[PDB]
Amino acid sequence: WVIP
Amino acid sequence: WVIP
Amino acid sequence: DSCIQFTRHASDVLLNLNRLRSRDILTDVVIVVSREQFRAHKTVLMACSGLFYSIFTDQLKCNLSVINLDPEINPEGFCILLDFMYTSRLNLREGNIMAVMATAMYLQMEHVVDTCRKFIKASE
Amino acid sequence: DSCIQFTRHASDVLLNLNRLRSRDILTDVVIVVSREQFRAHKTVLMACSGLFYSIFTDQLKCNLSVINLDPEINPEGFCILLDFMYTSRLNLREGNIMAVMATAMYLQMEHVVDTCRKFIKASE
Ligand SMILES: O=C1Cc2cc(Nc3nc(Cl)ncc3F)ccc2N1
Ligand SMILES: O=C1Cc2cc(Nc3nc(Cl)ncc3F)ccc2N1
Ligand SMILES: [Cl-]
Ligand SMILES: [Cl-]
Question: How does DSSP classify residue C63?
Fold first, then answer.
């Protein structure tokens, strides 16, 4: 999961 | 396009 | 094999599937979550959720155009997860995380359940 | 928004859609390319091809379960492109590049047409  |  | 691969293909496909959903093009099921209704594509639901995969591989249920979820399921939690299915983006907030995690457990969306557990653990 | 994003989601969705295709689950159209038949999901075809997007948004054609392509289309070229739609991988070879490019132009798959043009230019 990432900060888009 | 890339070499997978 | 000796194939070449277009990096953005899968993301571009998903973006187009979400555009079809927006535009109500070739949607083939209504998911009912108490008083709310959500239109979607069975194949996208099956690709994202172990519960929908089981439902639409059933020889009788595969033919239904309406699926009613358990009354305990929160419509906003379902909406957030449906948007995630079609976009890869999850609108996880302090005010919705419990409903989102409960819905993802029910729908059998293991990666979502994983990030919810991690975010909850960080606040404890 | 303040969404989080699961990097592998789109690729995992496409992998699952290809598993449904393998297993002939919820396929809803047959594409006929002379003597050959290919089963697929209309939504995946529309998401990848400008021609299929136009066909299945037509109020009459959207309801067809069989689509016959132009007799000039090569079945192997179509097969290679159908596999690309469901996997992001293109089996481009000296022996098939002309048929693949012609098929991608007909299907309106601009990124494929682009890599074919580049590979052809490099051999000249
Ligand atoms: O957490 C999750 C997400 C999820 C999706 C699916 N979907 C499919 N699985 C397979 Cl093997 N082939 C085709 C599919 F559409 C099954 C189980 C699960 N569990
Ligand atoms: O080279 C290409 C690939 C391609 C795909 C599509 N697909 C869709 N386009 C839109 Cl805007 N919304 C939903 C769709 F399924 C249209 C045109 C083109 N041209
Ligand atoms: Cl997930
Ligand atoms: Cl393309």
Answer: G
In single-letter form, the type of residue at position D27 comes to T
Q: Is D15 exposed, middle or buried (0-12, 13-18, 19+ CB in 10 A)?
A: middle
Quoted resolution (Å): 1.8
Ordered by start, the domain boundaries in chain D are 1-124
Q: How far is the CA of C50 from the centre of ligand 3 (A)?
A: 9
Place of tokens 């392509």: D69
Experimental method: X-ray
Q: How far apart are CA D121 and CA D124, in angstroms?
A: 5
Residues of C in contact with B2 (CB under 8 A): 4-5, 7
Interchain proximity B4–D89, CB inside 8 Å: yes
In Å, what is the CA distance from D35 to each residue of D49, D70, D80, D91, D118? Answer: 22, 12, 16, 22, 31
Instruction: Give me the residues paired with residue C38 across strands.
Output: C31
* Cβ-based burial of D95 (10 A; exposed 0-12, middle 13-18, buried ≥19): exposed
Residues in contact with D122: Cβ distance below 8 Å, sequence separation at least 6, in sequence order: none
Q: CA distances (Å), C119 to each of C108, D33, D71, in order?
A: 18, 51, 56
* Residue linked to tokens 């949607």: C27
Q: Does domain C1-124 have CATH number 2.40.50.100?
A: no
Question: Atom 6, ligand 1: which residue's CA is nearest?
Answer: C50
